[PDB]
């Protein structure tokens, strides 16, 4: 009358002086649990171990709070189905190569700061008309944003890039870079050339070697790898 599924979860407590990172095993009856991994994490926190800490909010894959490494791959716990194979133990880690605040909560301050550094907002050279009439944009030029604006900033793609592991301090990563591309090709933006000159350095953009782990792990089905390649094509063709 049960189905015991095993979860091995990374644990670390900054409040314990001397606590070393450890894996803890929890047993969950899948008959009394939802289909997604976040449902198991919430069930464990509610009933088994209320000290288990993790980010969550929307539980529907739109906010991007519950990004973590489930079974070797970065994904959203709220949309990652539980492996019903009771023989295998699902291993849950934080996002890879990230400073751990506590348990499964990484520090995304640098990730957020890199997104601010590319100035992700509409910039027109004549902003004396802002708040008057809606800017015109054709359906075809609006279609160019499909696949780019749905990014939820979960950092599943950036934390899966090996170049981001070795050079996360100066390489922006696939998440920020795709958003930089989202504003380069926005037909309403007038700072397209300025946004490319910012990437004229060996690290911000050109640390991408087309490894393509970013696209494989994106829970939104987006392709930050292809957007980076479109940036590289723009960098080599634009004039000043």
């Amino acid at each position: 009358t049960s189905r015991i599924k095993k979860f091995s979860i990374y644990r670390w407590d900054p409040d314990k002086p001397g606590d070393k990172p450890r894996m803890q095993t929890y047993e969950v009856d899948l008959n009394k649990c939802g289909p997604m991994v976040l449902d198991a994490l919430i069930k464990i926190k509610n009933e088994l171990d209320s000290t288990l800490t993790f980010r969550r909010s929307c539980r529907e894959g739109i906010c991007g709070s519950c990004a973590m490494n489930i079974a070797g791959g970065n994904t959203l716990a709220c949309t990652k189905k539980i492996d019903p194979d009771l023989s295998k133990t699902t291993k849950i880690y934080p996002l890879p190569h990230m400073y751990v605040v506590k348990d499964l909560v990484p520090d995304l301050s640098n990730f957020y700061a890199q997104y601010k550094s590319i100035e992700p907002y509409l910039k027109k050279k004549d902003e004396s008309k802002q708040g008057k009439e809606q800017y015109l944009q054709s359906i075809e030029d609006r279609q160019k944003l499909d696949g780019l604006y749905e990014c939820i900033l979960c950092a599943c793609c950036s934390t899966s890039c090996p170049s981001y592991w070795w050079n996360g301090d100066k390489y922006l990563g696939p998440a920020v870079l795709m958003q930089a591309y989202r504003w380069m090709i926005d037909s309403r933006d007038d700072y397209t050339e300025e946004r490319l000159a910012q990437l004229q350095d060996p690290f911000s953009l050109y640390r991408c070697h087309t490894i393509m782990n970013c696209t494989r792990t994106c829970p939104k089905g987006l392709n930050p790898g292809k957007a980076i390649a479109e940036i590289k094509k723009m960098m080599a063709t634009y004039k000043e």
Partner: protein, 139 residues
């Protein structure tokens, strides 16, 4: 009211002096075929580059010229199975890096970025690597 440069400096200054651990990555992340093929392209590149430089150093430091060492190997009368092993082992990294290099040049044109195409192009590179390494090593 801090800018992104200050937030990045605050991030590193805070975390590098803290007691927070770095979450695992190498020992825990799941591998895939494109991931293994990307590093192999780097490995064969480093191997070919250092094999060219070793050959270049031998030209400046060995007391005999190339036709002499070719005659020395022939006199040893090595078996065909041993000759085929060295030919295949030497042409395999060059064959792989060449096919996967064209695949990288295709990527740089913005073509073949659908994830199902990345798996296709990788498998095509592998069979062309084996085909061109078996034909050349037979000559």
């Amino acid at each position: 009211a801090t800018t992104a440069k200050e937030e990045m400096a605050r991030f590193w200054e805070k975390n590098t002096k803290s007691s927070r651990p770095l979450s695992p990555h190498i020992s825990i992340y799941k591998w895939s075929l494109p991931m293994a093929m990307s590093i192999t392209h780097r490995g064969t590149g480093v191997a070919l580059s250092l094999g060219v430089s070793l050959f270049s150093l031998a030209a400046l430091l060995l007391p005999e010229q190339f036709p002499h060492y070719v005659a020395v190997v022939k006199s040893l009368s090595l078996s065909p199975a041993l000759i085929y092993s060295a030919k295949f082992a030497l042409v395999f990294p060059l064959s792989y890096h060449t096919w996967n290099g064209i695949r990288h040049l295709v990527w740089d044109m913005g073509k073949g970025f659908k994830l199902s195409q990345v798996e296709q192009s990788g498998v095509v590179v592998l069979i062309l690597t084996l085909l061109s390494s078996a034909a050349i090593a037979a000559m």
